From a paper:
After numerous attempts, we were successful in crystallization of a chimeric protein consisting of protein S2 connected to S1NTD (residues 1 to 86) via a five-amino acid long linker (S2–S1NTD). The crystal packing analysis showed that the interaction between S2 and S1NTD is formed inter-molecularly between two symmetry related molecules. The S2 component retains the two domain organization consisting of a coiled-coil and an α/β globular part. The Zn2+ binding site in S2 is partially occupied, Zn2+ being octahedrally coordinated by the side-chains of residues Asp188, Asp204, Asp205 and His18 as well as two water molecules. The structure of the S1NTD comprises two spatially separated structural motifs: the 11 N-terminal residues of S1NTD form an α-helix (from here on referred to as S1NTH) that is connected to the four β-stranded globular moiety (from here on referred to as S1D1) via a seven amino acid residues flexible linker. Notably, the S1NTH is structurally disordered in the free form and adopts an α-helical conformation upon binding to S2 through a ′folding upon binding′ mechanism. The aromatic rings of two phenylalanine residues, Phe5 and Phe9 located in the S1NTH, form a stabilizing π-stacking interaction with the aromatic ring of Phe32 located on β-strand 2 of the globular domain of S2. In addition, the core domain S1D1 interacts with S2 via two salt bridges: the side chain of Asp39 of S1D1 interacts with Arg208 of S2, whereas the side chain of Lys43 of S1D1 protrudes towards the Zn2+ binding pocket in protein S2 and interacts via polar bonds with the side chains of Asp188 and Asp205 thereby stabilizing their Zn2+ coordinating position. In the case of S2 and S1NTD however, the PΔG,IF values >0.7 indicate a less specific interaction with a smaller interface area, suggesting that the dominant and specific stabilizing interaction in the complex is between S2 and S1NTH. Thus, we believe that the interactions between S1 and S2 within the chimeric S2–S1NTD complex are physiologically relevant and reflect the interactions between S1 and S2 that are observed on the ribosome.
In sharp contrast, protein S1, which is essential for translation initiation in Gram-negative bacteria (1), is still lacking from the high-resolution structures available for Escherichia coli and Thermus thermophilus ribosomes (2). The protein associates late during assembly of the 30S ribosomal subunit and interacts with a pyrimidine-rich region in the 5′ untranslated region (5′UTR) of mRNAs. Thus, the protein shows RNA chaperone activity and is essential for the binding and the accommodation of structured mRNAs into the decoding channel. Structurally, S1 is composed of six contiguous domains (D1–D6), which are connected via linkers providing the flexibility that is likely to play a role in recruitment of mRNA transcripts to the ribosome.
Residue numbers in the entry:
A (entry chain A), B (entry chain A): 2 to 258, 262 to 311
The structure:
């Protein structure tokens, strides 16, 4: 996975802040200045982004959970779009101190959110006074704005992808403390020190932000599915055996002896065994019950069967 | 997209029916017979499946809708799994004559399904007698079993993918009449004539059926997203220009003159214009209102702006 330099140039990825606003720590990523404005060196952005994408692909491929964080105007709606498009998670309105470091508390706040969700729907709020119903409605607003993108995360994320390292410094510091790797777009006015995988680039243009998140969402989908990887395993070696050769070889795989197999499905009075024939074999449960009339085997168990 | 011959052999794709059950029309796809059973020639299955996958990829890439059809025991639950995994549609319980050819009627039956959905939830059924409520409950059962996988299809499909051509002959004939292309697994006991893209193979093993649907769902996801295609466009040509060359070239793209731009977002009193700077420009709506105080422009419109 990569984005080309020409694509980044068109999106404005190389536009830094005015030089008077810079953080000197971004010097290695700066190409120069034109008209009192810093130009970001895409010669560095491209390999550093590829490096970031490769590791996010690896994390996603072990069922890793990715938290997209971006709450500034330019990032907010796109962060949600990206996260949804690859079945991950997000914070896009505002960060509450402790979302990560006090995660056991957040977990309870999530159940409280779901209870308030139910209450607002099943008429509980209508049986309250206006003053009370408003209290619960504002609480539900706070919880949904802040936790709505993570309510099904189910534990700490395995990585953070962040738009604007300075704007999101609180979250980045929590991740640091927990040893959660941080991938971030770092603009010329920002401190890169807390960022594990820095991506030098413009964090102020919707089109630039969209370019980054798109490449991220794609590589995360590829990590989960293994679509393109499993496919490009057919070119790694010779596969030109004839069917005839392969079929005759498979006939000699028969030794010796009645057959052996594996349960794949147990619906009452129907036990299903894959013994590698044309069809799986559906067996009456009775052959698999003990003296008390209970099922002895489980889906995935190994068994025997009579040809 | 492809499945290897070794993968098909392991899944049992080559196991045909007993020869006494064959349809002579399947002769070109048959390798031979062992123990009074027909062996399917995978030398033919592999290129014919690749051919089918390539055209399904093309159909999906123009936002085509794919209807997965499989109602026999071995196909039923996997057909649903596959369809869901690539955001398409399915029929997996039983085919009602006219689902395709009388589609304008099906459309009304879909709204009737949604109304019954609401009624069963909002307590309408509880206000009925038992005899009446049972009538509506059975109607809801019929509609959900048959239309549940297509209720958001929104029109005729652009292709059918079918498990077992003989078992699903009714649907295949409706598609024929409507000119909708049929992709189907055709076993040695079946008639291939109605099938546009026949895939000679075992249609009785869950593991074989799973192998086919998996490859289909992947190629459909790839058609929609263009993940792997857009990525493998970076290898088609030289991309070794230095950033310096590219940046200096982009500086000469400035001619002449105040700037020109494109609206991207209109939220009351905030009009957003992309003029290719570091940030999009947010302009007060007032500059864009006519004498009556109405908005003159729309999202996507072209405008002008003062630097
Ligand atoms: Zn910035
Ligand atoms: Zn069959």
């Amino acid at each position: 996975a990569t984005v080309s330099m020409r694509d980044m140039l068109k999106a404005g990825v190389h536009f830094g802040h005015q030089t008077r606003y810079w953080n000197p720590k971004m010097k290695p990523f700066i190409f120069g200045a034109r008209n009192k404005v810093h130009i970001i060196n895409l010669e560095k952005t491209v390999p550093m982004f590829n490096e970031a994408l490769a590791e996010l692909n690896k994390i996603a491929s072990r069922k890793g959970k990715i938290l997209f964080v971006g709450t500034k105007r330019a990032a907010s709606e796109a962060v949600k779009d990206a996260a949804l498009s690859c079945d991950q998670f997000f914070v896009n309105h505002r960060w509450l101190g402790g979302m990560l470091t006090n995660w056991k508390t957040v977990r309870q706040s999530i159940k409280r959110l779901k209870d308030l969700e139910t209450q607002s729907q099943d008429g509980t709020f209508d049986k309250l006074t206006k003053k009370e119903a408003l209290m619960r409605t504002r609480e539900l607003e706070k919880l949904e704005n802040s936790l709505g993108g993570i309510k099904d995360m189910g534990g700490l994320p395995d990585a953070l992808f962040v738009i604007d390292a300075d704007h999101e410094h609180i979250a980045i510091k929590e991740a640091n403390n927990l040893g959660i790797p941080v991938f971030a777009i770092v603009d010329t006015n920002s401190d890169p020190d807390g960022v594990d995988f820095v991506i030098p680039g413009n964090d102020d243009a919707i089109r630039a932000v969209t370019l980054y998140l798109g490449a991220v969402a794609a590589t995360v989908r590829e990590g989960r599915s293994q679509d393109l990887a499993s496919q490009a395993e057919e070119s790694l070696y010779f596969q030109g055996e004839s069917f005839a050769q392969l079929f005759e070889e498979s006939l000699k795989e028969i030794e010796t002896r009645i057959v052996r197999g594996v349960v794949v499905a147990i619906d009452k009075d129907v036990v299903l065994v894959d013994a590698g024939l044309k069809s799986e074999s559906a067996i009456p449960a009775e052959q698999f019950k003990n003296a008390q009339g209970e099922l002895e085997i489980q889906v995935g168990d190994e068994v025997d069967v009579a040809l």
